[PDB]
Design a protein around this ligand. Structure first.
Ligand SMILES: CCCCCCCCCCCCCCCC(=O)O
Ligand SMILES: CCCCCCCCCCCCCCCC(=O)O
Lengths: 217, 336, 5, 54, 296
């Protein structure tokens, strides 16, 4: 039946074993999509991680290997390539808190956040959210009122209340409040604090994914 | 200031010219032909081994080998007759939205969110497949790439620009600017002198590869265009769109001839390919199943279910023997 | 498992 | 603003194109389909002795 | 007075046979053929074959109880039925323990389950419940035999050391061999799997309550409705069996008639778990529930 293609079938099986081993080594890594609203911040959280196209940053924390796809260089219709990231564990979304006065930039960041959060592909994908430049925010809120971006805001212009209001406005954009959780964090200069938060959020996402697969959740 | 009204007047003039030439519709002329609507295709093979969504496949001119790309970073070349995997190429970037197999069969190409078309040399003195040239000149992602010969590859991009590349030099010999939206697909003419590119602006433009200027522009799609394929003559092409509609545009008539729509189908088309005779239009919808449109009558002659997720890519063999549909289910099925 | 007796 | 004049120039060549009646184009497509119908394995099932996928 | 305790036993076997064969078949067909092989689904497939072959074996038990202990099938059919039953029941218990440990490891230690919980490791591990089930079923395969009765009836009672035909020695030898089977029943087939299920479903419930990661009580409800179901179905029989294995000498003369029907009704409750495992692991999963309706 098979004479000289028996070795062809042997090669097919050998390269299939190699495909499976590589596939296990790929499924081992946790995939994070970094859909940063602006060049600001998105670059900063990338440096705070251990380390033209789409940049794939690889780092390992506590025996968990991460892949961060910085897709900011892909300035095109996000609708036609966003489905490529349908299976990412989490979407690290990076916002600059000091963008409220700059131009409306914060309003654009919310438009992008609503675009990805209520997306047909990321219905069950948890969105880690980093509000960056909290230091620049602390100095800025002293002189520039937050009523510039939010007329509806009615609170003392202090860093804690203003930051809480911005976090509330971002976290309130998700219509799907059950299958998704927006893990929010104000970025600390220490690289360890920022990565730990990502590790904790992704461990929560892995636990929830296991619960859904095992039928508990 | 005057240019905008001049352009509007020219658009009205071209529309009037098309309306003048539309003496009759395709459906009226081909209403008396035999309705060949009994198309049952059993899956003859299930090529398995991809561990992620398959976005692109392309048959070889030998109509036996086929290269398929997927998001696990692997181009696999399948001996479709025996289901064997001839090669497994580990791509530098797993985000590959397209792949092509050279007409000579010596090379394969793949590209995607990396913005780079990688050319791989299958036939080398060493036993491994090595990348010959990475064609990096696009600012937008690569949605399609088709080989014209061992040296010329045409590549549609997500930056509104279709490019013509010289592989040995590695530099664009022609850039087809003119689309206003991301170009999602390409289709080379059978004679390789023309190629139609469909874009997200719902406009499919016929280009000339020799000088590089848009020969004709076709509109008629409501939403984004996802797939395009020349009729075997090269005098017509079908287009697949997010609006659940295929349309047959004729190059000489310069206007749409047939609309391929059904009310129960409300899902976008991810892939389009014609049969060897052009009598069948194989449209791969994202409702998880392909369709078989009788191209001359717009009556759905058949369905090709058997795929769990959306049929991302579809291709008919150069001899028309088989139709390989690849899907996000990680499985390619060859039908006959 | 089974108590045969 | 160069894009506007460029679009105007392109829409000029689209305007002066030697078009053909849609009846002729439809007839040509129908004629090709009829001519190559026999050499098309999908339209009519091919015997398993001639089909390479079994 | 005790005739009533028999009809319930017959129905519990009857409901278990039909529901078990249909439901588990669904699990094997949908999970094994229709769905992709993930670690969780292969574990469910193993449990499904374990509690399907046993339910398929149940008609032999119903007929045997019907004919007052007569085993009319033969020698090979008694060897195969009893060998299959013990392999399956012991497995339908070790696999429940393995599923509990899997759900425990994939919640308590998510990093490990991400890095190492692959279908390859899963298939390597799933032999351990089967290999344990086969090694503990060897007393059935090497000793269980059809033994003739002077009363005009044949029985499937274990025959030990047929080499010694001493009436007195046979009872003494059996008491000892059957005590070993009893301790192994309450320290490997009930205590160890119950301990693993209780510890696993307690630790994951404790974590998902302390973390507060869950929003609905459905995870806690499913954990309770699985652990309690396993305890409710097997605790009766394993309890009666232990009192019987601590009273075997007296049972081998027929003196304690009561345990005779105690072992029977309770064992039917134990077998009920085999049919309800498909009802409680795969059909409470929406992915499987959607896949089954779409499968047809
Ligand atoms: C029914 C008793 C429990 C089930 C049987 C034992 C389960 C397997 C325990 C070991 C699993 C693999 C441990 C090493 C994993 C590794 O290599 O990191
Ligand atoms: C690094 C320390 C890890 C400690 C915990 C390891 C647990 C190993 C046992 C896992 C049992 C389940 C694994 C999949 C098997 C299956 O369910 O099919």
């Amino acid at each position: 039946l098979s004479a000289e293609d028996k070795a062809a079938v042997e090669r097919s099986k050998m390269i299939d074993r190699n495909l499976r081993e590589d596939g296990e080594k790929a499924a081992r890594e946790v995939k994070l999509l970094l859909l940063g609203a602006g060049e600001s911040g998105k670059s900063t959280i990338v440096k705070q991680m251990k380390i033209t196209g789409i940049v794939e940053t690889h780092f390992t924390f506590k025996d968990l290997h991460f892949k961060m796809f910085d897709v900011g260089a892909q300035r095109s219709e996000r609708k036609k390539w966003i489905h490529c990231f349908e299976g990412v564990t989490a979407i690290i979304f990076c916002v600059a808190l000091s963008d409220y006065d700059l131009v409306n930039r914060m309003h654009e960041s919310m438009k992008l956040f609503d675009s990805i959060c209520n997306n047909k592909w990321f219905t069950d994908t948890s969105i880690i959210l980093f509000l960056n430049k909290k230091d620049l925010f602390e100095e800025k809120i002293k002189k520039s009122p937050l009523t510039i971006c939010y007329p509806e805001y009615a609170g003392s212009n202090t860093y804690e209340e203003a930051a809480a209001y911005i976090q509330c406005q971002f976290e309130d954009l998700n219509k799907r409040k059950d299958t998704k959780e927006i893990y929010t964090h104000f970025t600390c200069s220490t690289d360890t604090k920022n990565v730990q938060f990502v590790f904790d959020a992704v461990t929560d996402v892995i636990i929830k994914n296991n619960l859904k697969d095992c039928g508990l959740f | 200031d005057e240019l905008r009204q001049e352009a509007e007047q020219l658009k009205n003039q071209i529309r009037d010219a098309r309306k003048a030439c539309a003496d009759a519709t395709l459906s009226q002329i081909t209403n008396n032909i035999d309705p060949v609507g009994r198309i049952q295709m059993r899956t003859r093979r299930t090529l398995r081994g991809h561990l992620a969504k398959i976005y692109a496949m392309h048959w070889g001119t030998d109509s036996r080998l086929l290269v398929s790309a997927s998001q696990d970073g692997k181009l696999i070349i399948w001996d479709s007759y025996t289901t064997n995997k001839v090669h497994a190429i580990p791509l530098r970037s797993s985000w590959v939205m397209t792949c092509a197999y050279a007409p000579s069969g010596n090379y394969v190409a793949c590209g995607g969110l990396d913005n780079i078309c990688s050319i791989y040399n299958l036939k080398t003195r060493e036993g491994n497949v090595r990348v010959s040239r990475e064609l990096a000149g696009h600012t937008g992602y690569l949605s399609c790439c088709r080989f014209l010969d061992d040296n010329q590859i045409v590549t549609s991009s997500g930056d509104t620009t279709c490019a013509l590349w010289d592989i040995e030099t590695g530099q664009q010999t022609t850039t087809f600017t003119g689309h206003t939206g991301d170009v999602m697909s390409l289709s080379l003419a059978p004679d390789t002198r023309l190629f139609v590119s469909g874009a997200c602006d719902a406009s499919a433009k016929l280009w000339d590869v020799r000088e590089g200027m848009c020969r004709q522009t076709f509109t008629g799609h409501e939403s984004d265009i996802n797939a395009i394929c020349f009729f075997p003559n090269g005098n017509a092409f079908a287009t697949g769109s997010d609006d659940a509609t295929c349309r047959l545009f004729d190059l000489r008539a310069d206007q749409e001839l047939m609309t391929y729509s059904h009310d129960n189908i409300i899902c976008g088309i991810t892939s389009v390919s014609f049969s060897k005779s052009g009598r069948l239009l194989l449209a791969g919808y994202d409702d998880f199943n392909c369709n078989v449109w009788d191209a001359l009558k717009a009556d759905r002659a058949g369905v090709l279910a058997g795929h769990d997720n959306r049929v991302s890519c579809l291709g008919v063999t150069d001899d028309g023997m088989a139709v390989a549909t690849g899907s996000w289910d990680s499985f390619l099925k060859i039908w006959n | 498992m089974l108590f045969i007796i | 603003i160069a894009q506007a004049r460029k679009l105007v120039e392109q829409l000029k060549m689209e305007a002066n194109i030697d078009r053909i009646k849609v009846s002729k184009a439809a007839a040509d497509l129908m004629a090709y389909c009829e001519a190559h119908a026999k050499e098309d394995p999908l339209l009519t099932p091919v015997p398993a002795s001639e089909n390479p996928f079994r | 007075g005790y005739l009533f305790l028999d009809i319930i036993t017959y129905l519990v076997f009857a409901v278990t046979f039909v529901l078990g064969v249909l439901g588990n078949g669904l699990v094997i067909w949908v999970a094994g053929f229709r769905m992709t092989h993930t670690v969780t689904t292969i574990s469910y497939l193993n449990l499904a074959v374990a509690d399907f072959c046993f339910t398929s074996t149940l008609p032999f038990f119903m007929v045997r109880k019907a004919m007052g202990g007569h085993w009319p099938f033969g020698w090979f059919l008694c060897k195969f039925v009893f060998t299959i039953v013990d392999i399956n029941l012991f497995g339908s218990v070790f696999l429940i323990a393995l599923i509990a440990l899997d759900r425990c490891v994939c919640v308590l230690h998510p990093v490990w389950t991400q890095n190492h919980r692959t279908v390859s490791l899963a298939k390597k591990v799933i032999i351990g419940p089967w290999v344990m089930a086969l090694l503990l079923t060897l007393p059935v395969i090497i000793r269980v035999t059809t033994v003739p009765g002077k009363t005009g009836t044949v029985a499937c009672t274990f025959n030990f050391s047929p080499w010694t035909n001493d009436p007195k020695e046979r009872i003494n030898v059996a008491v000892a061999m059957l005590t070993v089977r009893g301790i192994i029943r309450f320290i490997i087939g009930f205590s160890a799997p119950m301990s693993i299920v209780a510890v696993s479903y307690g630790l994951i419930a404790t974590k998902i309550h302390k973390q507060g990661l869950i929003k609905s009580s459905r995870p806690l409800r499913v954990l309770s409705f699985v652990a309690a179901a396993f305890f409710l179905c097997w605790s009766p029989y394993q309890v009666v069996a232990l009192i019987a294995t601590v009273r075997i000498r007296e049972l081998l003369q027929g003196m304690y008639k009561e345990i005779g029907i105690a072992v029977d009704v309770t064992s039917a409750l134990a077998f009920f778990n085999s049919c309800l495992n498909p009802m409680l692991y795969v059909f409470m999963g929406q992915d499987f529930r959607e896949r089954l309706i779409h499968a047809l």
